[PDB]
Subunit: 230 residues, 4 copies
């Protein structure tokens, strides 16, 4: 289509996302830089804390948007739902733009607030973990994103975007970070990966960026399929 | 307005808050001192543990004081709801006093049960990080409180596990910047008991930041 | 009174408790040794882990009992509920015995798996931790137990005219938490008992004079905290 | 009763399990190597993080299935339910095969990815630990599995399972059991990593990770008799 401009109710939805993806990148990267600025060892929340920031914020945010926009906060979630015709192309694109914009903004106030540490320690930016190759990173993003989007589909509440459960993704995000943080820093979310690439602006991070789009999009589509066979 | 002194139903609500905010500052600062007061590199709950004490106690307390007073435990929550024509001025003020009083009470005891450790380690009071500025602290309190009050509004059900979390999360980001306030009574209580010039000097941030975050919090649900 | 020795239905309830309090002391003290027994820097689940074992097991166990016997797992919970007369004297006593017995068994079952570690690493006992005095310990047990029993009262519902054990999920996640939280504040003070059976079981198995000397605190503190709460739910 | 293959409404269920047990062994062992590899003091997730990966993934996965396959992800869960004729022998066997296969794939997906560090750190496979004997390990698997299956039975419905309980019921057992047996309680989970890691010591201990959970499961089931 291309004529779904049903006033008020939607150019709102795209703003529900915005503000959402914003406080998502804030909190998390606000906690990922918190990590490293560490003068003393075993004195921060630790990677476990980082994993919780990501999972816990997706639980909180999907709870808050749930019946307003649906609660995507993530272009690969939007893409999976699109690829099932559970949303339209126009809504999908509007959402993805609002998410990528919000993401950039979040890793901004982080920047201001926290200067020096932001460019001193990875900048929440996602690059391939020293040691593994691009194929491994990609594979880990695929599977990671599959776990997320498989949970979302089952998190689809049938009562024309659908509602979404949260404690499940809360967890479905948390879990993937526990496995995936070492290898890539864990993305599973093209807007999250894009935002910090824009703000951190490093050649190495831009070089790896394609993985954080292609891996999640594939993992997401593989979901619509698992939800096609069955 | 003097429009209310209701037989039961309210001079109770202000007591639901009291006792609530009390065990809130107890538990937490009771856990913020028994980490600092540590001799085993690792053995202390871990900042992560502190963050859980704050989030987990707000989950428990809002659960208990849910249908009994609105479950505020926090003047910035009360203020947001007030600025929402969801609470009256008189109730709001009574709540904030009951919260600030309960908060003071919480700490005092911690500092009786363990005067030494408490005294020797910053009294769990909320100050400014030893490497940033007042503008950053304020900004971090604003945003932090926005995350909390935005969750509360959506946590209206004409309610817990969400704030449990909404508090927990903000502490994970904010503990290294201010100590994570987002709660003027929590910040006031330990300033009263710890009584340090540096902590009193920064105290305004823990009122103004949350009140602002709350007000932009009230209104985001205005353009939605 | 004395007639609720109702075939099946109850001499079962007292067994629901038993088996419960058993796997409670197992898991936890099974995790309190499994930490104290380290060699590598920060290689144990962490005290945070211990706090979770206690809170998380009370969530799981109250979930499993609930509509099978109420889900007490704790003489101070039973005592608070008794002091509201919503569990008769006879049921109360039967519960407390079943809890204290189960507790001994659990722990014992650990000293049985990790004979060596156990003793030499603290015994999973509840004492006064170096530094503080008996008055502080008592105060911390009182308040700690108040937080627990206040949560329980509010964790009570007028829901069972039809069925429970399978109802609109909540009742356990609150205490899960209400136990977890108190351990985060109280572990450094007296390891946190808030549970006379939990404190009794490991005192029986560990059998140290210092732990027996402090034991009264783990009965009197929780009973007071329970009554204080069990009163706050009258004048509230 | 074997009169059951009725096209789709099942050769699917056995695939719900497959894909489930797969991402279960992935995530976890993907996090168990992830822990063990990290150099730095207080770096990776922490044993606490590992315990969460196991518990949290069973919560997520039982949430995603259950309502359409029962949500077993575990031969000892299937076995307990079988003893309590709430499942047939044929379904039970099909499930256990699908779980053991998925597990191998998951473990085998972990390795041919982060192999270097992988092979260096016990493949995350279930073993015994320098401190306790076989009797202790077995006892700890029995009891551990009892806690799990007792929760499952109560996690049953009159209308299927409710997760946050097992989420937790798995998490808790790992906090107690990781030191002694790196926590088992799941024959497919133990089998998968034994197949991929392929060490003589791990194959020697493997029987414990079948017999312990099966006993713990039966004891639990039979608790739905005298209860």
């Amino acid at each position: 289509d291309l004529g779904e401009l049903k006033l008020w109710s939607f150019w709102r939805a795209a703003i529900a996302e915005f503000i959402a993806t914003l406080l998502f990148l804030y909190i998390t990267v606000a906690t990922v830089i918190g990590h490293s600025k560490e003068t003393v060892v075993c004195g921060s929340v630790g990677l476990l804390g980082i994993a919780w920031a990501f999972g816990g914020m997706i639980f909180v945010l999907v709870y808050c948007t749930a019946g307003i926009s649906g609660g995507h906060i993530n272009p690969a979630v939007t893409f999976g739902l699109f690829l099932a015709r559970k949303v339209s192309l126009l809504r999908a694109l509007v959402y993805m733009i609002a998410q990528c914009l919000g993401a950039i903004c979040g890793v901004g106030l982080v920047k201001a607030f926290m200067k020096g540490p932001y460019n001193q320690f990875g900048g929440g930016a996602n690059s391939v973990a020293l040691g593994y190759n691009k194929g491994t990173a990609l594979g880990a993003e695929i599977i990671g994103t599959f776990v997320l989007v498989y949970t979302v589909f089952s998190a689809t509440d049938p009562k024309h975007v659908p509602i979404l459960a949260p404690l499940p993704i809360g967890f479905a995000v948390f879990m993937v970070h526990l496995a995936t943080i070492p290898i890539t820093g864990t993305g599973i979310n093209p807007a999250r990966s894009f935002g910090a690439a824009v703000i951190f602006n490093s050649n190495k991070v831009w070089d790896d960026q394609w993985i954080f789009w292609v891996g999640p999009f594939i993992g997401a589509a593989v979901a619509a399929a698992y939800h096609q066979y069955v």
